[PDB]
Homo-oligomer: A and B are copies of this chain.
Amino acid sequence: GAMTGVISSSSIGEKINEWYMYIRRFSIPDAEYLRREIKQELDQMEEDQDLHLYYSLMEFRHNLMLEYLEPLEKMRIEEQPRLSDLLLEIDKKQARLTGLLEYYFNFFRGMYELDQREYLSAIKFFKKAESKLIFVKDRIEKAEFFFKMSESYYYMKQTYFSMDYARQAYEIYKEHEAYNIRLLQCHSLFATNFLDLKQYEDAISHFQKAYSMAEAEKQPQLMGRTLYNIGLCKNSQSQYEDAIPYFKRAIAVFEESNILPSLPQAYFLITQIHYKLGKIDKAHEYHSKGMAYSQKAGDVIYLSEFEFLKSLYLSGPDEEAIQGFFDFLESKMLYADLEDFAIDVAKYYHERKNFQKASAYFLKVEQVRQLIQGGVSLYEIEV
């Protein structure tokens, strides 16, 4: 599907949330342990500054925990206030810090729930985080929220909300300067959602706009992703001849800049396209390179998918290797890839008048669509 992509650490945010839970309970050894463990981790990482802003605040909240406990040392246990009453006091006198921590807590707890594929739960925490945006005074930090809500709702395919949030983030980024990289990213969010709605031309316009902006910013990871995504739009519309140039330009960018993570996917559709077109000559060359990149990075999913291309276009087809591939994708919950591929096989046969085979794979497409793919649980509701 579309190149998005990359950089979760739902791990760390949720660790800071747990640290906060230990802080509110005055679980001192546990709070000290996490205070140390998380620092070490965040130290090997110019990645989110999300996490960094949050860490600082909890650092300060940890120190206030210790300040409020210092008096208790000059006290008989019977004189000392209950810890629940100590906590009520901290929160009273730091209404503002409390609400900003409550913002991040829900935010990162939602991100974690999302990684756990607990969607309704994730939305619940995301809405509670949105309620605490009043505690987020900085406008760019508000826009970051909206931006990551757009990504999140893109992953959940709540297309309309993903675009509404991208438009909220856009409004803010646009009125500052060089938030231009975030702005072009808003463009790819519009584009990727347009694509899911089958609005290919509008997706292409936003991908082109985003490309132009990435070139001006000299952001080659982004230049290549948008190039790739425009070829994808063309490919989905069976406009094979227009797809190829974008796929080639995307490959060149990634390579010239040594972007290894992106290269197995960058090589994949272009390889499929040549098999489809009967240009076996040029297919085998693309198949080998992308095959070689997948080996280097140990891309399990792309190794398996390049092997699929040989099972269909070269090897019979090997219906047996195809079924096991489908079981593999299914077991990995790669349901979109699976449906597309099951169509590819149906279409392969259809075009060769093996209507009985085409048809069995069209029935397989149906069997995948009937699977619970993004299922949900009600929180505390009794039937």
Q: At the interface with chain B, which of A39-47, A77-85, A263-271, A367-375?
A: A367-375
Distance from A234 Cβ to chain B, minimum over Cβ atoms (Å): 14
Taken residue by residue from 150 to 190, chain A's Cβ proximity to chain B (1 for < 8 Å, 0 otherwise) reads as 00000010111101100100100000000000000001001
* Set of chain B residues within 8 Å of A379, measured between Cβ atoms: 167
A328 within 8 A of B: no
Q: At the interface with chain B, which of A59-67, A274-282, A357-365?
A: A357-365
**Is there contact, CB below 8 Å, between B120 and A378?**
no
Q: At the interface with chain B, which of A204-212, A250-258, A294-302, A315-323?
A: A204-212
- In-complex Cβ contact of A158 among B161, B167, B194 (8 A): B161
Number of contact residues on A: which range applies? 35 or more
Distance from A1 Cβ to chain B, minimum over Cβ atoms (Å): 15
* Set of chain B residues within 8 Å of A123, measured between Cβ atoms: 160-161, 164
* Set of chain B residues within 8 Å of A199, measured between Cβ atoms: 372, 375-376
Distance from A208 Cβ to chain B, minimum over Cβ atoms (Å): 7
- In-complex Cβ contact of A359 among B190, B362, B374 (8 A): B362
* Set of chain B residues within 8 Å of A127, measured between Cβ atoms: 164
**Is there contact, CB below 8 Å, between B119 and A372?**
no
Taken residue by residue from 340 to 383, chain A's Cβ proximity to chain B (1 for < 8 Å, 0 otherwise) reads as 00010010001001011011001101100011111110110111
Contact surface of A with B, Cβ cutoff 8 Å: 119-120, 123-124, 127, 156, 158-161, 163-164, 167, 170, 187, 190, 193-194, 197-199, 202, 205-206, 208-209, 237, 343, 346, 350, 353, 355-356, 358-359, 362-363, 365-366, 370-376, 378-379, 381-383
**17 residue pairs from A and B, CB less than 8 Å apart:** A124-B164, A156-B160, A158-B161, A167-B378, A170-B381, A197-B373, A197-B375, A198-B371, A198-B372, A202-B375, A208-B383, A346-B362, A350-B359, A350-B363, A353-B356, A355-B355, A362-B362
